[PDB]
Amino acid sequence: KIVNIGAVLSTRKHEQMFREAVNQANKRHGSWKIQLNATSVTHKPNAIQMALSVCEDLISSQVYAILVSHPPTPNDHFTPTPVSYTAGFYRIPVLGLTTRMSIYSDKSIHLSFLRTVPPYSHQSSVWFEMMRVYSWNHIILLVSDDHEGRAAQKRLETLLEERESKAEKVLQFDPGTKNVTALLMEAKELEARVIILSASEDDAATVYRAAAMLNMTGSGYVWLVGEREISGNALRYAPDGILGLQLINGKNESAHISDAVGVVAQAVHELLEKENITDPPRGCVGNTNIWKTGPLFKRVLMSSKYADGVTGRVEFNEDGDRKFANYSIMNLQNRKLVQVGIYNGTHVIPNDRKIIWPGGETEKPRGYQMSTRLK
Amino acid sequence: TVPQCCYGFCIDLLIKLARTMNFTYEVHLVADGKFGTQERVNNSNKKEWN
Amino acid sequence: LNIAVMLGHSHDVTERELRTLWGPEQAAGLPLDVNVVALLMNRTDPKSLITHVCDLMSGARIHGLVFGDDTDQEAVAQMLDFISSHTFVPILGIHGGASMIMADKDPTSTFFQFGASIQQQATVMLKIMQDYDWHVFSLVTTIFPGYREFISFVKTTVDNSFVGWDMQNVITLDTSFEDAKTQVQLKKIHSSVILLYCSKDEAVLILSEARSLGLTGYDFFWIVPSLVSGNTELIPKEFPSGLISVSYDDWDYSLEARVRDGIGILTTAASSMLEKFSYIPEAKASCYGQMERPEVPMHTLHPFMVNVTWDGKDLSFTEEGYQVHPRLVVIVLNKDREWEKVGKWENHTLSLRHAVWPRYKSFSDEPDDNHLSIVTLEEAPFVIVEDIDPLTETCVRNTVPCRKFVKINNSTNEGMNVKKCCKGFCIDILKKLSRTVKFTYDLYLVTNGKHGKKVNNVWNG
Amino acid sequence: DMQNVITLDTSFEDAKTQVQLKKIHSSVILLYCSKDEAVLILSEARSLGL
């Protein structure tokens, strides 16, 4: 009955928050005498290692699920591949607590890995809402050439052509491309000024310099920005009036602890309702044996609903990303963020703050500018 | 690529549409002289309009 | 200089030292003193992975990697990413899960694995639909992530085909054990050749359900690759005649032949090193140490694995590490539920088969006796026999192939059943009788006599 | 225009029935049964969509 549940953080105080939420989990509508013992190891300094605690300590203590932040610095290439894939052997379900790297969405390889925080490509869908907030048809799609970027392309190209809206250009980028000036002159060829933006900080920042450099920033030139570009120097070269995005409760990770423990506790009680509960192996030696209830863990976690999360309804997508996460949509205006857009997930709530369109005024522009020049 | 004199029905129509429609017309010759159909490129599958 | 080898428990390690001595004394006798640490095991076990990694990274920084296991767990080959990206040493996957490629290869990974080139699989499957003219489909996958890949394969490669492949759509089982929704989706299959991408126990479910549907009848056909066959040594019970997989198995091969091939591949890439360098990036110092960086200043084999040929075999890989000339041992279950070879794919990836169309032949009978032996004369315009044009298939719009008996000599009169394209009145009429009498009509051509002769009333023709 | 009299053999076969019931392929469905058999058939044909 005792379910050991992992937690990979930077602190041990929020590991204690897991311990106390595990206490609540034994309390709140969950029945077991000792159906939980707490297991929690912080993020490791060597991202090589990443399985010492897991096999030697967690799987040896038969941990069923682990709850992991980005990293203890959260900002290098220490996006958590190695612990995940060491849990990717034998169908061990893991919830990415905060993650938005939709590389981890790739369920062909990311077998047992679902996210409380939906990645950037879900943000793709949100722009469609604003399409119909602002009646657009001439479309500039700008993709740093990424598996996440191309998966976001997939979401975009679907959610376009489902309603048969048609993109003009998807220009495509490596990171570090600074001679985008050719692609920028390509961008000078259009009716459209609907500038839909996806890269890291620095690509964006140099492009803001170069495009501002073109001149290319005037009302109409609407900068539709991914949140990697809502950090660092992409902050610091972008003009003003620019829409940015925010997931509401993307960072209350204490609320993420509370929600995740309530979810996983009542999902454990759904597991104890099931029959033939296969055993967690202790050793990562001699145990060549996949969880048979691996896919049954997946059927538990996909079919369990939790409207009672602190962040709202902890109720996921088909991809295991929470449905109807609250959005707030922002405007650097004198580089001072001006909230306008708010979503339950889909319900359009423009704040009474006006959108200075990110060159000129507060008037809804046109990417519709004819040439009368017929090739 | 020499710009060369052109004559015809369609010119008359385009000037009618310059009148009724207020456009300018950027008029070129085909390198192919052909419509160009979906035909496969090398790798022998790439069915592309030519 | 060094190769490490860890195996499924199989042909022995003493046998492996003999294979190492034989490869070392075979040809191009190794200025690099190439030296191998080889064992047999049974573990998919990451602590065992950690031990063997730390022992052989500590042990003289071993330089080459050849692996064929007796397992099936595919994701452990994806767990070789951390070796390929924490030792940055090129990994040869031959058997086990190391054969089983669902690893979409990374810029950080150093994988070269001999197995599941999924593209080459798809092309082989399509040429299977070609080479007995199985244009009429019925498509079933499940929704394992990674089967949507195959769905995109079908969409693109049929839409990149002017052949006009006759489509019955990819009817995907959503989850297992729906069992009412499944057979609702399964009464939507309405053709002969049934094309499957599932798991193995899902195939137990589907053959159990389709023996209730009768779709396992023995004029239907069933082509299921090494995803569900896996070990041809594993022949489960509901699994009839004519089941067809494609697999890089040691039925055509051995372990050690592939081993000496791959060792030579490693040493030719190391030769291209000592061409373009005169140096080798060794393995890292340790497991747990993040010492300076992972700056491979002597530049591991991904440009050097571009050009490798061995012994007439272009054993170079793709940029995605798949075989330029793949092997693709196409093995077929028969009446006795026996995986037996039909096809091979090593010559320009072209089919190499037995010309045996009918094989669905009363395993779980469902005995099918409808095949009507029709052997006629070339009688224009009742019978006008064309040949096979290389017109992306053997498919002219109104033709049926007709197996003539083409004698080899005037002496060796072995009439080789050559399929030839066919038209005429009577063929249109037999199409009308496939429309009315509705059977299968076995078309051949008369060699001995014309119509019939009273050769003491021994009839000819 | 005939689609044949597809007779349910015994009640509560429930797999053989819907095997026989995926053989109905037209609009007008003409019934001679009992009442609880019709409860069964409308329950099953709401699953068939007939």
Per-residue DSSP letters for A35-46? -EEE---PPPS-
Question: Which among A135, A87, A132, A129 is positioned nearest to A112, based on CA atoms?
Answer: A87
SS3 content of chain D, % helix, strand, coil (to 5): 40, 0, 60
Residues 6+ apart with CB under 8 A from A256: A97, A98, A116, A117, A249, A311
**The residue type at A343:** Y
- Interchain CB contact of C102 with A (< 8 Å): yes
CB-count exposure of residue A172 (10 Å: 0-12, 13-18, 19+) = middle
Cβ neighbours, 10 Å, residue A75:
10
Compute the distance between CA of residue A340 and CA of residue A331 in angstroms, rounded to an integer: 7
User: Which two structure tokens, joined as six digits, stand for C115?
Assistant: 């197995």
Q: Where are the alpha helices (DSSP H) in chain D?
A: 16-21, 35-48
Cβ neighbours, 10 Å, residue B4:
6
- Interchain CB contact of C348 with B (< 8 Å): no
Under 8 Å between Cβ of A95 and A65: yes
Chains D and B, touching by 3 or more CB pairs within 8 angstroms: no
List Cα–Cα distances, C385 to C377, C389, C391, C431, in angstroms. Answer: 10, 12, 16, 15
- Interchain CB contact of D19 with C (< 8 Å): yes
CA distance between the termini of chain A: 74
Compute the distance between CA of residue A122 and CA of residue A325 in angstroms, rounded to an integer: 10
> In this structure, are strands A169-173 and A140-144 parallel, antiparallel, or unpaired?
parallel
Which of C182, C187, C188, C190 to mutate to probe the D interface, most D CBs <10 Å? C187
- H/E stretch holding A332: strand A327-332
Under 8 Å between Cβ of C399 and C421: yes
A/C interface, count of CB pairs below 8 Å? 72
Under 8 Å between Cβ of C294 and C88: yes
Chains D and A, touching by 3 or more CB pairs within 8 angstroms: no
Compute the distance between CA of residue C327 and CA of residue C336 in angstroms, rounded to an integer: 26
User: Which two structure tokens, joined as six digits, stand for C117?
Assistant: 């080139």
Compute the distance between CA of residue C389 and CA of residue B11 in angstroms, rounded to an integer: 47
B/C interface, count of CB pairs below 8 Å? 9
User: Which two structure tokens, joined as six digits, stand for A282?
Assistant: 């202790």
Residue A354: strand pairing partners: none
In this complex, do C161 and B40 lie within 8 Å of one another by their Cβ atoms?
no
Residues in A closer than 8 angstroms to C146, CB to CB, are: 108
Question: Which among A89, A157, A85, A90 is positioned nearest to A121, based on CA atoms?
Answer: A157
List Cα–Cα distances, C197 to A259, A347, C14, C150, C224, in angstroms. Answer: 38, 40, 39, 8, 7
Residues in C closer than 8 angstroms to D18, CB to CB, are: 183
In this complex, do B47 and C157 lie within 8 Å of one another by their Cβ atoms?
no
Under 8 Å between Cβ of A93 and A297: yes
Chains D and C, touching by 3 or more CB pairs within 8 angstroms: yes
Sheet holding A349-350, edge to edge: A242-247, A327-332, A341-343, A349-350
Question: Which among A83, A82, A149, A85 is positioned nearest to A121, based on CA atoms?
Answer: A149
List Cα–Cα distances, C195 to A122, A182, A304, in angstroms. Answer: 34, 47, 34
Residue A242: strand pairing partners: A332
Compute the distance between CA of residue A87 and CA of residue A80 in angstroms, rounded to an integer: 11
- Of the CA atoms within 13 Å of residue B11, those in its CB half-sphere come to 6
Under 8 Å between Cβ of A16 and A39: no
Residues in C closer than 8 angstroms to B45, CB to CB, are: 157, 160-161
Under 8 Å between Cβ of C83 and C91: yes
Compute the distance between CA of residue A107 and CA of residue A84 in angstroms, rounded to an integer: 12
- 3-class state of residue A28 by DSSP: coil
Compute the distance between CA of residue C109 and CA of residue C300 in angstroms, rounded to an integer: 11
User: Which two structure tokens, joined as six digits, stand for B42?
Assistant: 């090398």
- 3-class state of residue A252 by DSSP: coil
Compute the distance between CA of residue B29 and CA of residue B27 in angstroms, rounded to an integer: 7
DSSP A58: I
Cβ neighbours, 10 Å, residue C121:
24
Compute the distance between CA of residue A363 and CA of residue A222 in angstroms, rounded to an integer: 12
Which of A371, A373, A374, A375 to mutate to probe the B interface, most B CBs <10 Å? A374
> If you write DSSP's letter for every residue of A61-100 in order, what string do you get?
TTEEEEEE-S-SS-SSS-SSHHHHHHSTTTT--EEESS--
Compute the distance between CA of residue C21 and CA of residue C72 in angstroms, rounded to an integer: 29
Residues in C closer than 8 angstroms to B47, CB to CB, are: 159-160, 162
Compute the distance between CA of residue A319 and CA of residue A115 in angstroms, rounded to an integer: 8
- 3-class state of residue D29 by DSSP: coil
Where do we find the tokens 């339950």?
A: A344
Compute the distance between CA of residue A269 and CA of residue A272 in angstroms, rounded to an integer: 5
Under 8 Å between Cβ of C318 and C127: no
- 3-class state of residue D35 by DSSP: helix
CA distance between the termini of chain D: 18
- Residue in chain A closest to C287 (alpha carbons) equals A48
Alpha-carbon torsion, ordered A6, A9, A12, A17, to 10 deg: -70
Q: Is C233 annotated as a binding residue?
A: yes
Compute the distance between CA of residue D50 and CA of residue D45 in angstroms, rounded to an integer: 5
Q: Is C178 annotated as a binding residue?
A: no
Alpha-carbon torsion, ordered C235, C238, C239, C240, to 10 deg: 130
Compute the distance between CA of residue A171 and CA of residue A139 in angstroms, rounded to an integer: 11
- What string of H, E and C letters represents the secondary structure of chain C? CEEEEEEECCCCHHHHHHHHHHCCCCCCCCCCCCEEEEEEECCCCHHHHHHHHHHHHHCCCCCEEEEECCCCCHHHHHCCHHHHCCCCCCEEEEEHHHCCCCCCCCCCCCEEECCCCHHHHHHHHHHHHHHCCCCECCEEEECCCCHHHHHHHHHHHHHCCCCCCECCCECCECCCCCCCHHHHHHCCCCCCEEEEECCHHHHHHHHHHHHHHCCCCCCCEEECCCCCCCCCCCCCCCCCCCEEEEECCCCCCCHHHHHHHHHHHHHHHHHHHHHHCCCCCCCCCCCCCCCCCCCCCCCCCCCCCCCCCECCECCCECCCCCECCCCCEEEECCCCCCCEEEECCCECCECCCCCCCCCCCCCCCCCCCCEEEEEECCCCCCCEECCCCCCCCCCCCCCCCEEEEECCCCCCCCCEEEEECEECHHHHHHHHHHHHCCCEEEEEECCCCCCCCCECCECCC
Q: Which of residues 288-327 of C touch A (CB under 8 A)?
A: 288-290
Compute the distance between CA of residue A47 and CA of residue A44 in angstroms, rounded to an integer: 6
Residues in C closer than 8 angstroms to B40, CB to CB, are: 160, 162
List Cα–Cα distances, A173 to A103, A122, A188, C29, in angstroms. Answer: 18, 20, 17, 47
- Residue in chain B closest to C161 (alpha carbons) equals B45
Compute the distance between CA of residue C382 and CA of residue A87 in angstroms, rounded to an integer: 68
User: Which two structure tokens, joined as six digits, stand for A199?
Assistant: 């890269």
Cβ neighbours, 10 Å, residue A71:
19
**The residue type at A14:** H
Q: Is C190 annotated as a binding residue?
A: no
Size of chain B, expressed as the number of residues it contains: 50
Question: Which among C435, C460, C431 is positioned nearest to C443, based on CA atoms?
Answer: C431
Under 8 Å between Cβ of C246 and C269: no
Q: Answer positive or negative: Cα dihedral of A69, A75, A78, A84.
A: positive
> If you write DSSP's letter for every residue of A189-230 in order, what string do you get?
T-S--EEEEES-HHHHHHHHHHHHHHS--STT-EEEE-GGGS
User: Which two structure tokens, joined as six digits, stand for A213?
Assistant: 């450099």
In this complex, do A374 and B28 lie within 8 Å of one another by their Cβ atoms?
no
C290 φ, ψ to 5°? -105, 90
CB-count exposure of residue C91 (10 Å: 0-12, 13-18, 19+) = buried
CA distance B50 to chain A (A): 17
Compute the distance between CA of residue B46 and CA of residue C276 in angstroms, rounded to an integer: 37
In this complex, do D47 and C212 lie within 8 Å of one another by their Cβ atoms?
no
CA distance B19 to chain C (A): 44
Residues in A closer than 8 angstroms to B26, CB to CB, are: 373-375
List Cα–Cα distances, C403 to C99, C218, C384, C447, C459, in angstroms. Answer: 39, 22, 14, 11, 22
Residues 6+ apart with CB under 8 A from C162: B40, B47, C392
- Interchain CB contact of C409 with A (< 8 Å): no
In this complex, do B26 and A374 lie within 8 Å of one another by their Cβ atoms?
yes
- Interchain CB contact of A189 with B (< 8 Å): no
What subunits make at least 3 CB pairs under 8 angstroms with D?
Answer: C
Compute the distance between CA of residue A231 and CA of residue A248 in angstroms, rounded to an integer: 17
Question: Which among A351, A50, A104 is positioned nearest to C82, based on CA atoms?
Answer: A50
In this complex, do C187 and D15 lie within 8 Å of one another by their Cβ atoms?
no
Q: Is C95 annotated as a binding residue?
A: yes
In this complex, do A373 and B24 lie within 8 Å of one another by their Cβ atoms?
yes
Q: Answer positive or negative: Cα dihedral of C370, C375, C379, C383.
A: positive
Residue C418: strand pairing partners: C404
In this complex, do B47 and C160 lie within 8 Å of one another by their Cβ atoms?
yes
Residues 6+ apart with CB under 8 A from C436: none
Compute the distance between CA of residue D19 and CA of residue C183 in angstroms, rounded to an integer: 9
Integer-rounded Cα Rg, in Å, for chain D is 10
- Interchain CB contact of C208 with D (< 8 Å): no
Question: Which among A336, A360, A364, A361 is positioned nearest to A350, based on CA atoms?
Answer: A364
Compute the distance between CA of residue A244 and CA of residue A357 in angstroms, rounded to an integer: 12
